[PDB]
Amino acid sequence: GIFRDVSLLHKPTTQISDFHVATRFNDDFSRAVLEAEVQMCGELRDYLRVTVSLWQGETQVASGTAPFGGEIIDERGGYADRVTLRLNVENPKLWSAEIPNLYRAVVELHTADGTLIEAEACDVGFREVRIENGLLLLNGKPLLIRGVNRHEHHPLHGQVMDEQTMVQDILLMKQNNFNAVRCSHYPNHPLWYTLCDRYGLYVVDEANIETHGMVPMNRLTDDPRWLPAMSERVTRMVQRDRNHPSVIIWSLGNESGHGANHDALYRWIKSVDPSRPVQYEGGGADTTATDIICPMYARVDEDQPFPAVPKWSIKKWLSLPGETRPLILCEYAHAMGNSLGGFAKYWQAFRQYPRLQGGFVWDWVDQSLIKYDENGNPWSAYGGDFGDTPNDRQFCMNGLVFADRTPH
Amino acid sequence: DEANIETHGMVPMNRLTDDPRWLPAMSERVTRMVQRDRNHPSVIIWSLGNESGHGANHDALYRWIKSVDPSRPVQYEGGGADTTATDIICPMYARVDEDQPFPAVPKWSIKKWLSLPGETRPLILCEYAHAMGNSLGGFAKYWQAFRQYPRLQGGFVWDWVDQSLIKYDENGNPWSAYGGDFGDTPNDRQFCMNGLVFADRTPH
Ligand code: NA
Ligand code: NA
Ligand code: NA
Ligand code: NA
Known part of the structure; x- marks a missing residue:
């Protein structure tokens, strides 16, 4: 069904069509450069200008204005419909799950005289994510991921999410010493990333690709005829969410084996967004398509030597x-019952x-649904309770909290 | 095959091995061993010595061996067992699961x-499973x-045979003796007997 919001947006003919925000730092993080690339559609005019201003609460920290026209990139020239503005920030307040410092960047499309055509804005978190010498670093310090996998589930509304449930989940997670969430296994409702930016949680953003039931598991992901469909699911997620500071890692999907399409899309992400590591578990969790060894349910001391994976x-x-x-x-400590x-x-x-x-517990909340008996009394239901067959019974309930968010 | 270099009693342990004035003496002990034994097939690894800290002389002699005989790895435990002077991490008495975080080593x-x-x-x-008693x-x-x-x-157990010596009482009856039994002082008593077999090669 239509399980997320529907809306109408009105834009002017000459408009902002895309903008990217990137942060670079010196060795001690005491100086930062905020690089904003803005793209437009419509008729280019010499009087057009773009202004990017950075705000810390009510105070303007930095600003820049430029006409359209990018630098030369190849033999044919540069992008006449793009501009890149670089703003220096001294002693920036860095973003982290411990202290989610945020700035407000406003992107203004306006003429030279000063009339505003259009404005767009996004929250900005100054933070650097990188793997150095085998360690995942955030702002120069090695992370310890206290993570959990979270499906978008509500016992009454199914997979329709609301701000109240999102806030309840985030508060419960932070109160129980979690600092990271894996979006298992798909891009989430857009408000989720804003709330994670605001409250402070590291986010693994995952493409909507899972072909677990295929035999072998990579039958589709190794087929070039499915590369376009897979690429759309990866690229559109990156294009939607690349500005969110809470997103620190991209994931190529879940349990789809290992095919050449995974390697291609891994490299595409590495080319378009070098600021975030890319991970993927399929094919044995240590393939060429992942920057992190991310196994599911590998044990602490005991080996499980399955053939080929x-x-x-x-x-x-x-x-x-x-x-x-x-x-x-990416998944461990299966919390079933x-x-x-x-x-x-x-x-x-x-x-x-x-x-x-660290790792991501599987998982946050039981996927139970509410049914009513002959007296209008609700009761929690699992697989098979709706006449669905074949089903996997109570394997849908693996959460640390009940579906009504009471704790196990 | 191990060079005859051990300066365990020095304070710090590398006081001599980091001094260029002792480089000739150390180099003789390494180079003459290599020159004597480089043809033996049983020798598969060279060692720069034992428990002498880590000094620049160790790095120099490691590189000398690597240049003259590339056919054998070089190992050395001193200075924390993972220095630039060893091809193999070769700690002594590192435990299987328990960390022992001493300062700097x-x-x-x-x-x-x-x-x-x-x-x-x-x-x-290079040493593990101390077989004392x-x-x-x-x-x-x-x-x-x-x-x-x-x-x-793998590893090398410490060690094969007890270093006990034979003394005779008032009736010509032999008995096994350890540190201090010869009037030697100061001594380290029974720490000389760490073997898997007795001095007469009967097994423990
Ligand atoms: Na760790
Ligand atoms: Na399940
Ligand atoms: Na082994
Ligand atoms: Na001894």
């Missing part, structure tokens, strides 16, 4: 010959090994 | 050591780890 113990995985990447479990035995073992290992930088 | 657990950022070398303990508790843990981790390629 083994789940080594996470301690052993780090030291395999020629392996240097960090390891962050009376569960989470052995969680302390994982966290002992996370604290002992530098390149074990 | 920590003994990480061997499993953790392999995965330290930027570390790629194999790990072979009723000992070798926990040996199975080491060998479980050795079999599970590819880059944990």
